[PDB]
C-alpha cells in the first residue's frame, strides 16, 4: 500500500497516481519574499460555531476527525474562495523530531507538524464529486510549533490511546475545531492538490501565517500512534509528510502586507 517509507513513500506515488508529477501539486515552499500581497482578497470567514464532529479514526496514514457535512454547519467562505465550503475532516502531518513534520515550508523552514482542515465546495453537492473539480476543495493549513500546550488540542490527544493502530476508530462528538486556530487569519493562498493519494488537483490552499504552539507532551502523543494494523510489526506513525513539490507556473498570494 502507499505510505511514507523507503519502499512505498512519496517518491513512489507517481506510479499509481501519475498526477503526482502534475502541474499543481502540493505542498510547496512558500517563499515569503516572492508571494504577492493581493489587496483584493477578502477576509477569510471561518464559521465553525455549529460544527458537528462524529468520529476519530486512525487511517494508517494520519488520524482524522470527521464531521457531519450534510448541512452548512462548519464552513469556510471569503478569502480567495467563491461560494461556501463545508468542513469534512481534519488531520495532521508530523515528524520524528521537532524540526520536521510540516508539509508546506516557509522560506524552507519546516515546522513540527501541520494541521489540515479539509472542506469541499457545496456547488458540487458531495465530496466525491468535488474531488473531480479544479475548485472542488479548500484546505486550511495551520503550522504547529513546540512551545506551550494548545488547550483546544488536548481532547484529541487524550483519545489517541484508543486508536493506536490502523482501522481503529472512536466516538468523537462535541469537538470544537475553533480551539485549533491561531489568533490571526492572515494567510497565503495558491492552487494545489491533496497531499495524499489520489493527489487530486482540486484544492485551493489557505495556509495561515501564524502557527499554533503545542506542547512537547502533545506531540509525543502523536508519535505513539502506529502506521500498522493491530498485531503487525510496530512501525511508529512519524514523518507522515510529503515534501515540497515544484511550484511550476504558480503564484502564491498573501492576504497581508
Ligand atoms: Cl507495504
Ligand atoms: Zn493533509
Curated annotation (Swiss-Prot):
Changing residue 194 to F: Normal activity. Its main location: cytoplasm. Zn(2+) binds at residues 91, 93, 116. Changing residue 91 to Y: In OPTB3; partial loss of activity. Changing residue 61 to W: Impaired activity, rescued by 4-methylimidazole (4-MI). Impaired activity, not rescued by 4-methylimidazole (4-MI). Changing residue 116 to D/N/Q: Reduced activity. Changing residue 61 to G: Impaired activity, not rescued by 4-methylimidazole (4-MI). It is linked to Osteopetrosis, autosomal recessive 3: A rare genetic disease characterized by abnormally dense bone, due to defective resorption of immature bone. Osteopetrosis occurs in two forms: a severe autosomal recessive form occurring in utero, infancy, or childhood, and a benign autosomal dominant form occurring in adolescence or adulthood. Recessive osteopetrosis commonly manifests in early infancy with macrocephaly, feeding difficulties, evolving blindness and deafness, bone marrow failure, severe anemia, and hepatosplenomegaly. Interacts with SLC4A4. Interaction with SLC4A7 regulates SLC4A7 transporter activity. Interacts with SLC26A6 isoform 4 (via C-terminus cytoplasmic domain). The record marks 89 as: Involved in the binding of some activators, including histamine and L-histidine. It holds the Pfam family Carb_anhydrase. The keyword Zinc applies. Zinc. Can also use cobalt(II) with lower efficiency, but not copper(II), nickel(II) and manganese(II). The keyword ATP-binding does not apply. This is Carbonic anhydrase 2. Changing residue 194 to E/H/R: Strongly reduced CO(2) hydrase activity. Changing residue 118 to A/G/I/L/S: Reduced CO(2) hydrase and p-nitrophenyl acetate esterase activities.
Amino acid at each position: 500500500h502507499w505510505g511514507y517509507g523507503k519502499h512505498n513513500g512519496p517518491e513512489h506515488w507517481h506510479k499509481d497516481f501519475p498526477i503526482a508529477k502534475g502541474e499543481r501539486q502540493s505542498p510547496v515552499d512558500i517563499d515569503t519574499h516572492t508571494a504577492k500581497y493581493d489587496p483584493s482578497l477578502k477576509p477569510l470567514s471561518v464559521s465553525y460555531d455549529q460544527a458537528t464532529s462524529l468520529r476519530i479514526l486512525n487511517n494508517g496514514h494520519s488520524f482524522q476527525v470527521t464531521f457531519d457535512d450534510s448541512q452548512d454547519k462548519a464552513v469556510l467562505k471569503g478569502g480567495p474562495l467563491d461560494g461556501t465550503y463545508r468542513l469534512l475532516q481534519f488531520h495532521f502531518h508530523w515528524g520524528s523530531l521537532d524540526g520536521q513534520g510540516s508539509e508546506h515550508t516557509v522560506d524552507k523552514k519546516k515546522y513540527a507538524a501541520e494541521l489540515h482542515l479539509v472542506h469541499w465546495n457545496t456547488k458540487y453537492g458531495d465530496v466525491d464529486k468535488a474531488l473531480q473539480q479544479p475548485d472542488g476543495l479548500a484546505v486550511l493549513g495551520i503550522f504547529l510549533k513546540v512551545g506551550s500546550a494548545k488547550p483546544g488540542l488536548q481532547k484529541v490527544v487524550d483519545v489517541l490511546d484508543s486508536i493506536k493502530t490502523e482501522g481503529k476508530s472512536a466516538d468523537f462528538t462535541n469537538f470544537d475545531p475553533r480551539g485549533l486556530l491561531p489568533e490571526s487569519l492572515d494567510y497565503w493562498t495558491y492552487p494545489g492538490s491533496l497531499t495524499t493519494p489520489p493527489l487530486a488537483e482540486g484544492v485551493t490552499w489557505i495556509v495561515l501565517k501564524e502557527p499554533i504552539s503545542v506542547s512537547s507532551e502533545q506531540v509525543l502523543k502523536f508519535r505513539k500512534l502506529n502506521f500498522n494494523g493491530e498485531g503487525e510489526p510496530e512501525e511508529l506513525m512519524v514523518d507522515n509528510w510529503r515534501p515540497a513539490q515544484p511550484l511550476k507556473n504558480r503564484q502564491i498570494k498573501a492576504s497581508f502586507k
